[PDB]
Scaffold this active site. Structure first.
Site, PDB file in Angstrom:
ATOM      1  N   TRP A 187     -28.662 -16.717 -64.118  1.00  0.00           N
ATOM      2  CA  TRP A 187     -27.613 -17.113 -65.038  1.00  0.00           C
ATOM      3  C   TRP A 187     -26.500 -16.065 -65.015  1.00  0.00           C
ATOM      4  CZ3 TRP A 187     -26.300 -13.666 -68.903  1.00  0.00           C
ATOM      5  CH2 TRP A 187     -27.256 -12.701 -69.271  1.00  0.00           C
ATOM      6  N   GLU A 213     -26.942  -2.017 -74.696  1.00  0.00           N
ATOM      7  CA  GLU A 213     -26.823  -2.653 -73.399  1.00  0.00           C
ATOM      8  C   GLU A 213     -25.665  -2.101 -72.569  1.00  0.00           C
ATOM      9  OE1 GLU A 213     -28.872  -4.736 -71.944  1.00  0.00           O
ATOM     10  OE2 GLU A 213     -29.983  -5.853 -73.494  1.00  0.00           O
ATOM     11  N   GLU A 241     -29.156  -6.194 -65.739  1.00  0.00           N
ATOM     12  CA  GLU A 241     -28.867  -5.669 -67.073  1.00  0.00           C
ATOM     13  C   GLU A 241     -27.383  -5.713 -67.382  1.00  0.00           C
ATOM     14  OE1 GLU A 241     -30.923  -4.912 -69.401  1.00  0.00           O
ATOM     15  OE2 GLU A 241     -32.847  -4.460 -68.424  1.00  0.00           O
ATOM     16  N   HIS A 290     -26.076  -8.528 -69.513  1.00  0.00           N
ATOM     17  CA  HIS A 290     -26.445  -8.511 -70.927  1.00  0.00           C
ATOM     18  C   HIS A 290     -25.302  -7.968 -71.775  1.00  0.00           C
ATOM     19  CE1 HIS A 290     -30.981  -8.173 -69.665  1.00  0.00           C
ATOM     20  NE2 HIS A 290     -30.372  -9.222 -69.141  1.00  0.00           N
ATOM     21  N   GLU A 344     -38.578  -1.994 -72.255  1.00  0.00           N
ATOM     22  CA  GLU A 344     -38.405  -3.385 -71.867  1.00  0.00           C
ATOM     23  C   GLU A 344     -39.053  -4.310 -72.874  1.00  0.00           C
ATOM     24  OE1 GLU A 344     -36.417  -4.701 -69.857  1.00  0.00           O
ATOM     25  OE2 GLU A 344     -35.853  -2.993 -68.608  1.00  0.00           O
ATOM     26  N   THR A 375     -36.872  -4.285 -76.143  1.00  0.00           N
ATOM     27  CA  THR A 375     -35.670  -5.114 -76.123  1.00  0.00           C
ATOM     28  C   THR A 375     -35.999  -6.612 -76.084  1.00  0.00           C
ATOM     29  OG1 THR A 375     -35.358  -4.834 -73.718  1.00  0.00           O
ATOM     30  CG2 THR A 375     -34.397  -3.209 -75.027  1.00  0.00           C
ATOM     31  N   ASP A 411     -34.912 -12.227 -69.449  1.00  0.00           N
ATOM     32  CA  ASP A 411     -34.745 -11.191 -68.431  1.00  0.00           C
ATOM     33  C   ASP A 411     -35.640 -10.002 -68.752  1.00  0.00           C
ATOM     34  OD1 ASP A 411     -32.807 -12.730 -67.170  1.00  0.00           O
ATOM     35  OD2 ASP A 411     -31.183 -11.338 -67.406  1.00  0.00           O
ATOM     36  N   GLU A 412     -35.631  -9.563 -70.016  1.00  0.00           N
ATOM     37  CA  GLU A 412     -36.404  -8.362 -70.387  1.00  0.00           C
ATOM     38  C   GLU A 412     -37.908  -8.543 -70.187  1.00  0.00           C
ATOM     39  OE1 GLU A 412     -34.000  -6.694 -70.344  1.00  0.00           O
ATOM     40  OE2 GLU A 412     -32.670  -6.740 -72.080  1.00  0.00           O
TER      41      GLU A 412
END
Ligand SMILES: [Fe+3]
Ligand SMILES: [Fe+3]
Ligand SMILES: [Fe+3]
Ligand SMILES: [Fe+3]
Lengths: 346, 346
Positions: free
Chosen positions: B45, B88, B126, B129, B179, B182, B211-212
């Site tokens: 994405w 982030e 990352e 984000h 990780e 978050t 994602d995390e």
């Protein structure tokens, strides 16, 4: 969907490991001469200073005026602007770059050495350049943010090998060159915006450019002192970087469609007079006179050969790399995914 | 205008230098087990997937609906969201973090080792984000972007010492913890948005959270193998990190006004159930069971002491760090420059 890769052999730690002590000794000197080129955070501009203000009643009209103006800015120039923005957004790579350097690396992520403080603070300043150009391009409606974001993800994933081989000598010459390069780059787009009468966009590019001038000043001062302490090694380092040719930070650009994206973007920037092969020669010429390479004495035979090579190169490149009869005329038009595959002359 | 500093002594290279060979040997193993937890760029994405589309006729109405919704989202929640976004955006620091680690560092900026490929690609993931949350917060009109940008510049300038001492053991335990942290953090704000009925903002936090989860999976797998190969050192490394207490990446937060900004932001996140002291204990408890620390055998006396310490800690912390009678009730209201000095309960 393979992004381009570095074609040269990776060489690590070419600086003699004892020469690390030099940079450790220069810690106080860096505090007094280099760190002073950073603007304190309270005194810095922020992207918000140059964008529609989303917490004002004027937000809608400001965004509308931005967009009205962006319609009269040609696609050519957006391609360049986008390429410049993407380069800025690969920032993490550039902090990693400085932190590969042997005597100057941040060993913890919060090291209190002058070098690590510089690196962190320089990064923090660069971060605003991406942020500001990002939101500007986003609001403009003239560009394909999804494809641009995709290019950025590829670019950070690809990283970059500037061929500085963990040597602060090679590295600080490299950043000296790059800082001046982006100064000219951003400065030219500023000047050109000031001419389509887009004052607000000129202000955006101008403020970024002025940051880069400070960075250049700082990095040339480091190399200046390296020429003071170690004239031999610094000339040999300068020459090494020239022979290799200065490869640009975003040269592995890839958007999932164009296998030569950097060349193609660079061609547009060349044709628009934003950043040219002539500019490349002018920067090398400037750094020769800035560091007074012509004026150096008491060098090794290898040093003298290197000194002579450096001074000869800019006029040589100014020739050899002028004959762009092919590039200027014939140049085809090609789609850029960054603008929804609309086409621009290369 | 001094940002807070790290209060602990900086310790470097605590892992025995021969143990670097382990990670060099594991290169192929990382390619086969870790790298597989990265989504290929084409499949990922991008922030544009979740924002008003500036190249559609629907732009104006989409931005308007975003802002209408944002008015109904309380200041408390924006403070947390803003602190999450700033964390982030300090991304460069975190790539630097991974590249301090002895056996796994990117030596050139484009190293073809599995570890370096991981680090670059993880960073690239990352980066979206911050981008996404930035443009979201910007468009909302609910927050002070200039003061946020200021906090980001301080944060990158300050960096962070996670106390991993150049050891991939300590480091990969540290990122495993972060990780998950978050994941819970972004996941909770997702869930809460899904409840003010803000589905588009829930999608924003949710996609980041997901994602995390992949990152956590990858890092816990590295530590899993470290427990396989070197059960002793990995338990001693796990215990070391617990005794120190896991310090958060953005703990040096500073906005030019509040000398305890991290504590104050954290308090709001605590009060809202976004991220709590209970979450901190739950994560440690999870990692104990995930790595099967209880199940380890054939350890040194020092190893056994470390094993026992680790298993005991989460229930102990769940107690010791529950008695928040003081924090829950009495808690004052205080301004946050991130929302124009409007105030929220701590
Ligand atoms: Fe820049
Ligand atoms: Fe710069
Ligand atoms: Fe993240
Ligand atoms: Fe993550």
């Amino acid at each position: 969907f393979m992004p381009p890769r570095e074609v040269h052999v990776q060489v690590t730690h070419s600086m003699p490991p004892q020469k690390i002590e030099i940079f450790k000794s220069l810690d106080n000197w860096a505090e007094e001469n280099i760190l002073v080129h950073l603007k304190p955070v309270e005194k810095c501009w922020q992207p918000q200073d140059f964008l529609p203000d989303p917490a004002s009643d004027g937000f809608d009209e400001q965004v509308r005026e931005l967009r009205e103006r962006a319609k009269e800015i040609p696609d050519d120039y957006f391609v360049v602007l986008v390429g410049d923005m993407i380069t800025e957004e690969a920032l993490p790579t550039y902090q990693t770059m400085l932190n590969t350097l042997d005597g100057v690396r941040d060993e913890t992520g919060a090291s209190p050495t002058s070098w690590a403080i510089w690196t962190r603070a320089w990064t923090a300043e660069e971060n605003r350049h991406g942020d500001l150009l990002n939101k500007y391009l986003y609001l403009s409606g003239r560009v394909d943010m999804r494809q641009i974001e995709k290019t950025i993800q590829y670019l950070i994933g690809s990283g970059m090998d500037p061929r500085t081989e963990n040597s602060p000598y090679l590295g600080f010459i490299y950043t000296s060159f790059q800082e001046r390069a982006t100064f000219i780059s951003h400065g030219n787009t500023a000047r050109q915006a000031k001419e389509h009468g887009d004052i607000k966009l000129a202000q955006i590019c101008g403020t970024i450019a002025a940051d880069e001038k400070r960075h250049e000043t700082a990095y040339t001062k480091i190399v200046e002192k390296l020429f003071e302490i170690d004239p031999d090694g610094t000339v040999l380092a300068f020459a090494d970087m020239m022979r290799k040719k200065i490869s640009m930070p975003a040269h592995l650009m890839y958007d999932g469609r164009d296998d030569n994206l950097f060349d193609h973007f660079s061609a547009v920037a060349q044709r628009l007079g934003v950043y040219t092969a002539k500019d490349y020669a002018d920067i090398l010429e400037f750094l020769v006179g800035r560091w007074k390479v012509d004026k150096l004495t008491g060098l090794s035979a290898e040093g003298q050969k290197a000194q002579d090579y450096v001074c000869r190169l800019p006029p040589r490149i100014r020739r050899l790399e002028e004959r762009a009869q092919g590039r200027a005329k014939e140049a085809p038009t090609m789609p850029f995914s960054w603008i929804f595959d609309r086409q621009v002359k290369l």
